[PDB]
Ligand binder design. Sequence first.
Ligand SMILES: *[C@@H]1O[C@H](CO)[C@@H](O)[C@H](O)[C@H]1O[C@@H]1O[C@@H](C)[C@H](O)[C@@H](O)[C@H]1O
Ligand SMILES: *[C@H]1O[C@H](CO)[C@@H](O)[C@H](O)[C@@H]1O
Ligand SMILES: *[C@H]1C[C@H](N)[C@@H](OC)[C@H](C)O1
Ligand SMILES: [Cl-]
Length: 7
Amino acid sequence: XXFXXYX
Ligand SMILES: *[C@@H]1O[C@H](CO)[C@@H](O)[C@H](O)[C@H]1O[C@@H]1O[C@@H](C)[C@H](O)[C@@H](O)[C@H]1O
Ligand SMILES: *[C@H]1O[C@H](CO)[C@@H](O)[C@H](O)[C@@H]1O
Ligand SMILES: *[C@H]1C[C@H](N)[C@@H](OC)[C@H](C)O1
Ligand SMILES: [Cl-]
């Protein structure tokens, strides 16, 4: 990953 969220 490396980004975040939450979707
Ligand atoms: C997500 O990132 C925030 C900001 O740094 C941090 O406070 C949370 O603990 C962190 O969540 C962790 O990492 C994610 C990728 C997992 O889905 C979540 O369950 C928790 O382990
Ligand atoms: C979850 O999915 C969305 C839609 O593709 C992305 O924008 C996001 O960075 C993550 O991959
Ligand atoms: C992260 C927080 C967000 N409110 C949620 O959407 C329902 C997602 C599943 O997790
Ligand atoms: Cl998510």
